[PDB]
Amino acid sequence: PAIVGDEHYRVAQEVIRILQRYKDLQDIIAILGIDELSEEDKQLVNRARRIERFLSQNMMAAEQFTGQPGSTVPLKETIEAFDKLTKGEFDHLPEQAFFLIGGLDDLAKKAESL
Amino acid sequence: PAIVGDEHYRVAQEVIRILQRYKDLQDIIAILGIDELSEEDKQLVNRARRIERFLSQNMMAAEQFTGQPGSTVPLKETIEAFDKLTKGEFDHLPEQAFFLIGGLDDLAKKAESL
Amino acid sequence: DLNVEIVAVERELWSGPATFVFTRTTAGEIGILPRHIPLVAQLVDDAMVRVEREGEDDLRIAVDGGFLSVTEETVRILVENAQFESEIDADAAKEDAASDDERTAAWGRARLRALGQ
Amino acid sequence: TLRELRGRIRSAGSIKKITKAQELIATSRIAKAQARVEAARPYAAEITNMLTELAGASALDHPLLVERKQPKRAGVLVVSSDRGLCGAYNANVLRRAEELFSLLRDEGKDPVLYVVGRKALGYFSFRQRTVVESWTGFSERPTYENAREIADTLVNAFMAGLGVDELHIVFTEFRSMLSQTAVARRAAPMEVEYVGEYSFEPDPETLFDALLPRYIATRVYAALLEAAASES
Amino acid sequence: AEREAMLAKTAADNRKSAEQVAAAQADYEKEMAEARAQASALRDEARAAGRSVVDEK
Amino acid sequence: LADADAMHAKALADAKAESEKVTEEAKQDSERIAAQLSEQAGSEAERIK
Amino acid sequence: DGQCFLESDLFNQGVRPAINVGVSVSRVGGAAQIKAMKEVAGSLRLDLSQYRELEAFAAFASDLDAASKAQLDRGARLVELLKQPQYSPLAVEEQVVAIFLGTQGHLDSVPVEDVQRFESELLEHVKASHSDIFDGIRETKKLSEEAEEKLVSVINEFKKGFQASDGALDPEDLEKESVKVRKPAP
Amino acid sequence: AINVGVSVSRVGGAAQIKAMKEVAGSLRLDLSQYRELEAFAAFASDLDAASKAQLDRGARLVELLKQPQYSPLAVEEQVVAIFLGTQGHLDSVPVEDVQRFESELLEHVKASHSDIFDGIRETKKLSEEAEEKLVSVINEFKKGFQASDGSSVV
Structure with missing residues (x-):
């Protein structure tokens, strides 16, 4: 936080906390099902499954893998988008909207495509 | 039973059984309290608490600190003491009467002290 | 003296000694005293019971449609739902009495009768 | 590895x-x-x-104490859990329910089915029979305000004689902590049992x-x- | 009519007394907790300003 | 009712006093923080020089 | 440059050829395909690897989101579409039309059990009546917009002509509820 | 990331000042009972109150043990940190505010009441006068604190 500033460090450590708790729960969810969890844990799994997909990106060199053109996401927009995700402000979107998409203007445009 | 007397084997199998029940029950006690038990098993825990205490001894190594001498019970006394204790003939004495006690005639001397 | 039981479908709601007890049945208003004739009656939908409790005391109880039973041994009141005036939800009952559902308004008026009005 | x-x-x-x-x-x-x-x-x-x-x-002449002249269609209530992990509970209930449907069809009646609990509703939506009504979200803690609605529906279905000629319940009796069983019993019409002597x-x-x-x-x-x- | 008005007035005076006791303690709490928030904000502004002095120096 | 309104007036006066006391205490507290941060700022300048 | 990882526990469950769609890849990708196949199939590996991840997750869910249900049903159409028997090769002109049905969603309404019959019976229908769609795709390597509109018109004409395969207790042990009467029997 | 459930020291208490034995002697037991209880967090309404208090304690101790890098605490400040948890004064603070409460209190005491720290360091013992002074100053600080949800903590 002395080098990147605290806004980046908070968001990075919150995203890792959520994805670590999700990786711990996968073995429960695979057997007992998501319907069995606490409300806070089930909410966290629905955030984590969105975060995992929002860490995917349409790279330029992947034009031959995906057909779609590539995109670059600014550092500030990356921080703002994961700050909103960890606080649930996109929990009303479908899970498939975040996949390969790039930034928030693209996320909105794919959530409107669905 | 071939190498030590049949009575010693019986009393050892009884003491192991009573402590194995209490070891199974400790979870219910810790999570739900003694008030969540029935009356048949709460009478078993009343004996198991006292057997677990009565295994304790004023060992000679402690004479450095306690100033009292260490006891050396005959085998033929300890098989009687646990035989009487597993049948519940001492349940009206508190746990403090069984700590660090040594032999059975000493339990009589600490019970009349408390 | 009387021995009185108020029994709700979920709980043995009250039990104790009494001198007199007043209530309103589908055949009419009634009140009973220790030597009363054996009887079985149904309360009206907006009914209340008042117990003249022994040692100079009282109870006021709203009763959702109960049945009343008497024998020289004991008085038993069997109730679907009940509420004491010492715990009545008084602010709501004035609006509950105005509802379009017959039993909901009746239960409102029962609680208003337990509130002395 | x-x-x-x-x-x-x-x-x-x-x-x-x-x-x-x-x-x-x-x-x-x-x-x-x-x-x-x-x-x-x-x-x-x-x-x-x-x-x-x-x-x-x-006089003992209430509808619930008198049988129909020629019964065709019997109502049954099955009750079941809203959660999983129960083990045999829902299976024991639903095996008794099918054993009862094969009794009723062996007398000559056909069952119409009312369901409590999301698990039996899932079973009688995989096997292709209809459910007349169902209730969910209270098998973990029933309150009398639910039993009221179930009894009103069943009794209004019997008293309509669409309508039914009988009422049954399928549920489990808790006998003791180590032992329990599914039981099926006729709730209506009721039997009258005279015994030796307001x-x-x-x-x-x-x-x-x-x-x-x-x-x-x-x-x-x-x-x-x-x-x-x-x-x- | 005045005897009946004394009964209505005793009920209204009692209700408004109880409402004023509840509102009085609540009104104190609203101002006091707002001052607690402003005390925390004033402390934090001096903490961040002292941090900006460290960073600049 | 006159007692309850007198307690309402007293409660507003005690809130004025209590809030004035708290905001004054925060003014002393905020100075203490600023002085320690300036001492840390000066010690960073000494250390790097 | 890429893997076709053939897994025995996919082979056994009727997914033949048994390509594990998670691990399998080609790193040259859609640079090694005709234009029509890049337009039609361009994301299909990522869509199926997502379906298998969703299917492993939702295996014990009692209920799902509307988009999750749509993906879980689309995935099951795609897996039935990709199955193929030994010694039944398809020309690229027949592969473009076969994958076109799955990607544009024309298979969505067909029940999953019959996807293989619907595929096979459409491909031989198009080969009998509308063979200019194959001559187009083969001679120019592209699905022209007019050929896409014609193909969709032939799919909607065919779908109406299709035919889906649309499918002890003891009375002495039964117990009676009772009302007692303290008078002897009449 | 110390795994307090498996790490050990064969020297033990002979390496701790008396003021630290007086505080930390129950801390390992509390964290062991919390590690056993951890699965009941989904169902805390139904758990018996005598262990619900041990769950609420253990979650506050696991927060109290976190620490930012390059900030080592002097012995006289960590004994007051472990005291807040182990004596149960922290039990009224919401979990998400615990490290902020610890860091704010230690700055407060280091300003207004350094004589608590001087007494701990110079005597190696948390005397009853220093303890009665400290608890008075913890309550006086609580009245001046606020939680991240805006609630009072008193």
Whole structure:
């Protein structure tokens, strides 16, 4: 936080906390099902499954893998988008909207495509 | 039973059984309290608490600190003491009467002290 | 003296000694005293019971449609739902009495009768 | 390879914590459910005493005490859990329900089916029979305000003779902590059992006719509390 | 009519007394907790300003 | 009712006093923080020089 | 440059050829395909690897989101579409039309059990009546917009002409509820 | 990331000042009972109150043990940190505010009441006068604190 500033460090450590708790729960969810969890844990799994997909990106060199053109996401927009995700402000979107998409203007445009 | 007397084997199998029940029950006690038990098993825990205490001894190594001498019970006394204790003939004495006690005639001397 | 039981479908709601007890049945208003004739009656939908409790005391109880039973041994009141005036939800009952559902308004008026009005 | 086995040990070591926790929780909830059964019992014992004493003076000619001349269509209530992990509970219920449907079709009747609990609703939506009505979201803690709605629906379906000629319930009796079973019994029409040997307001026929639907509501309530203690 | 008005006035005076006791303690709490928030904000502004002095120096 | 309104006036006066006391205490507290941060700022300048 | 990882526990469950769609890849990708196949199939590996991840997750869910249900049903159409028997090769002109049905969603309404019959019976229908769609795709390597509109018109004409395969207790042990009467039997 | 459930020291208490034995002697037991209880967090309404208090404690101790890098605490400040948790004064603070409460209190005491720290360091013992002064100053600080949800903590 002395080098990147605290806004980046908070968001990075919150995203890792959520994805670590999700990786711990996968073995429960695979057997007992998501319907069995606490409300806070089930909410966290629905955030984590969105975060995992929002860490995917349409790279330029992947034009031959995906057909779609590539995109670059600014550092500030990356921080703002994961700050909103960890606080649930996109929990009303479908899970498939975040996949390969790039930034928030693209996320909105794919959530409107669905 | 071939190498030590049949009575010693019986009393050892009884003491192991009573402590194995209490070891199974400790979870219910810790999570739900003694008030969540029935009356048949709460009478078993009343004996198991006292057997677990009565295994304790004023060992000679402690004479450095306690100033009292260490006891050396005959085998033929300890098989009687646990035989009487597993049948519940001492349940009206508190746990403090069984700590660090040594032999059975000493339990009589600490019970009349408390 | 009387021995009185108020029994709700979920709980043995009250039990104790009494001198007199007043209530309103589908055949009419009634009140009973220790030597009363054996009887079985149904309360009206907006009914209340008042117990003249022994040692100079009282109870006021709203009763959702109960049945009343008497024998020289004991008085038993069997109730679907009940509420004491010492715990009545008084602010709501004035609006509950105005509802379009017959039993909901009746239960409102029962609680208003337990509130002395 | 070792990494797969270290993963499976990490997995199973978590499951053992979660299942030992719910054994201890269920060991408390059976004490809450038995406390609620024994608290509900005093009302039903007194309503039975009052109903028998009214039946002694009544003509015994209420619809729920008289059989139909030619029955064709019988109503059945099955009750079941809103959660999983129960083990045999839903299977024992649904095997008895099918054993009962094969009794009714062997007399010559066809069942119409009412369901309590999301698990039986899932079963009778995989097997292709209809469900007339269903209720969910209370098998873990029944309240009398639900038993009221179930009894009104069943009794209004019997009294319509669409309509039914009989009423049955399928549920589990809690006998003891180590033993319980699914049971099926006819709730209507009721059998009258004569045995060796008051004022009424306004009349015994009027009270008996207004009391029997309230007895049916307390009997279905007592069965729902036995079902919830047995599930746990 | 004045005897009946004394009964209505005793009920309204009692209700409004109880409402004023509840509102009085609540009104104190609203101002006091707002001052607690402003005290925390004033402390934090001096903490961040002292941090900006460290960063600049 | 006159007692309850007198307690309402007293409660507003005690809130004025209590809030004035708290905001004054925060003014002393905020100075203490600023002085320690300036001592840390000066010690960073000494250390780097 | 890429893997076709053939897994035995996919082979056994009727997914033949048994390509594990998670691990399998080609790193040259859609640079090694005709234009029509890049337009039609361009994301299909990522869509199926997502379906298998969703299917492993939702295996014990009692209920799902509307988009999750749509993906879980689309995935099951795609897996039935990709199955193929030994010694039944398809020309690229027949592969473009076969994958076109799955990607544009024309298979969504067909019940999953019959996807293989619907595929096979459409491909031989198009080969009998509308063979200019194959001559187009083969001679120019592209699905022209007019050929896409014609193909969709032939799919909607065919779908109406299709035919889906649309599918002890003891009375002495039964118990009676009773009302007692303290008078002897008449 | 110290795994307090498996790490050990064969020297033990002979390496701790008396003021630290007086505080930390129950801390390992509390964290062991919390590690056993951890799965019941999904169901805390139904848990018996005598262990619900041990769950609420253990979650606050696991927060109290977190620490930012390059900030080592002097012995006289960590004994007051472990005291807040182990004596149960922290039990009324919401979990998400615990490290902020610890860091704010230690700055407060280091300003207004350094004589608590001087007394701990110079005597190696948390005397009853220093303890009665400290608890008075913890309550006086609580009245001046606020939680991240805006609630009071008193």
